[PDB]
Structure formats: structure tokens, C-alpha cells
Amino acid sequence: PQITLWQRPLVTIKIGGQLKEALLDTGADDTVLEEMSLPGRWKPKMIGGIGGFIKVRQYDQILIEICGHKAIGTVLVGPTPVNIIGRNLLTQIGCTLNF
Amino acid sequence: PQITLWQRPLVTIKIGGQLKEALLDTGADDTVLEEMSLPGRWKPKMIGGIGGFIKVRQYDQILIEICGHKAIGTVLVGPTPVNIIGRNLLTQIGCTLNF
Numbered sequence: 001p002q003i004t005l006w007q008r009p010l011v012t013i014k015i016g017g018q019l020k021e022a023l024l025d026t027g028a029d030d031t032v033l034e035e036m037s038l039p040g041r042w043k044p045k046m047i048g049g050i051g052g053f054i055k056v057r058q059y060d061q062i063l064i065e066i067c068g069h070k071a072i073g074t075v076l077v078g079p080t081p082v083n084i085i086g087r088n089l090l091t092q093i094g095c096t097l098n099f
Numbered sequence: 100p101q102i103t104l105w106q107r108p109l110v111t112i113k114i115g116g117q118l119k120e121a122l123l124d125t126g127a128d129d130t131v132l133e134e135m136s137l138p139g140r141w142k143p144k145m146i147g148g149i150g151g152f153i154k155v156r157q158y159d160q161i162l163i164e165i166c167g168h169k170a171i172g173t174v175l176v177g178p179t180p181v182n183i184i185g186r187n188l189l190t191q192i193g194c195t196l197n198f
């Protein structure tokens with residue numbers, strides 16, 4: 001499927017047993033989801049961009065279903081304004097930028 | 100061209116006669132560049148990022164070349180870690196996400 005950018009590229013993902021809307025973000029190295037609970041151990045980390053830095057929790061080997069596709073990778077959790085799917089997971093589903 | 104996401108999708112842009120590196124950022128609605136001198140007048144603009152909202156300077160009808168593709172649009176100048184090419188300009192060059 002081809003996705004134009006006239007509107008934010010939002011898709012439905014499945015994690016921890018529930019569905020969520022997320023933003024496909026080529027400008028993000030990793031994936032960050034709103035504050036939630038996840039099984040396993042995590043490490044503190046800080047990420048920054050417009051507006052400053054926020055503290056998140058880094059989880060490894062997390063299973064996430066993006067557009068009915070199973071991809072596994074690093075997931076950050078913190079006070080982000082919106083769920084973001086980063087390159088670390090975009091590459092796994094064979095997503096590319098074209099023009 | 101088709102750009103894979105294993106690495107950051109950086110491209111060279113041409114603005115004001117000089118070359119610069121920028122990131123193709125589908126997660127950004129707007130285009131934000133690091134501090135620089137742009138012609139004409141500006142108006143205040145409040146944008147929301149990962150770390151909160153900030154005020155930036157907005158310049159309209161700016162000629163920007165992206166990968167040899169000419170575009171004319173709104174460019175915002177403010178504190179940012181990288182030059183960001185958002186959806187407003189990505190749509191002008193016919194960029195899409197495919198998988």
C-alpha cells in the first residue's frame with residue numbers, strides 16, 4: 001500500500017494486547033509509546049527534539065503488530081504527546097520513502 | 100529515488116544559495132530549520148514537539164530545493180537539533196511511504 005502525506009500518516013498497531021493509533025515517523029530513530037506497562041526490565045534514557053527533552057524507559061525485544069505485520073524491536077515509553085513508530089520498526093516491515 | 104530506512108533519511112537541500120543537510124521527517128507537520136537569515140518578514144508560530152511547545156519564526160513563500168526538486172512554501176526557523184523537512188514540503192515533491 002502507498003501512503004500519501006496530505007495528512008499525518010496514522011496507522012493502527014497492536015501491543016500488550018490492545019490496539020493503538022500511531023504515527024509512522026521516518027524522522028525518529030526509535031519507537032516511543034505513551035506511558036504504559038510492559039513486562040520485563042528497562043533502562044532509563046533521555047530523548048530530545050523540539051520543546052526539549054523527556055525521560056523514557058527503554059524496553060528490548062518488544063513484539064508489535066503494525067498493519068497486520070509482526071515486527072520485534074526496541075520500544076521507549078514515556079510522556080510523549082503521540083505514539084510514534086520509528087525507523088527501527090519501519091525497516092522491519094519493509095517500509096520505504098519514495099519520490 | 101527509493102529511500103530505505105536503515106539509516107537516517109538525510110538529503111542535501113539548497114536554500115539561499117547554500118547547501119545544507121536535512122532530515123525527511125514524516126512525523127513533522129511543518130518544516131523547521133536551524134537559525135539562519137531568511138528574506139522578508141516573519142510572524143510568530145507555536146509548534147508542538149516531543150518536549151513541549153515553542154515559539155518559532157514563520158517565513159512564507161520560501162524557495163527550497165530538495166534533492167534537485169524545487170519547492171516553494173512555509174519554512175519555520177527555531178531551536179532544533181536538525182534541519183527538518185516536514186509534510187508541507189514532502190507533499191510538494193511527491194513523497195509517499197510504501198510497504
Ligand SMILES: O=C(N[C@@H](Cc1ccccc1)[C@@H](O)C[C@]1(Cc2ccccc2)NC=C([C@@H]2CNC(=O)c3ccccc32)C1=O)O[C@H]1CCOC1
Nearest residue numbers: 027028029030032047048049050126127128129147148149
Ligand atoms: O517534532 C516534531 N516531530 C517529531 C514527532 C512528533 C509529532 C507530533 C508531536 C510531538 C512529536 C519528530 O518527527 C521530529 C524529531 C526531530 C529530531 C531528529 C533527530 C534527533 C532529534 C530530533 N524526530 C524524532 C524526534 C524525537 C525526539 N528525539 C529523538 O531522538 C527521537 C528518538 C525516538 C523517537 C522520537 C524522537 C524529534 O523530535 O514535529 C513538530 C515540529 C514540526 O511539526 C511539529
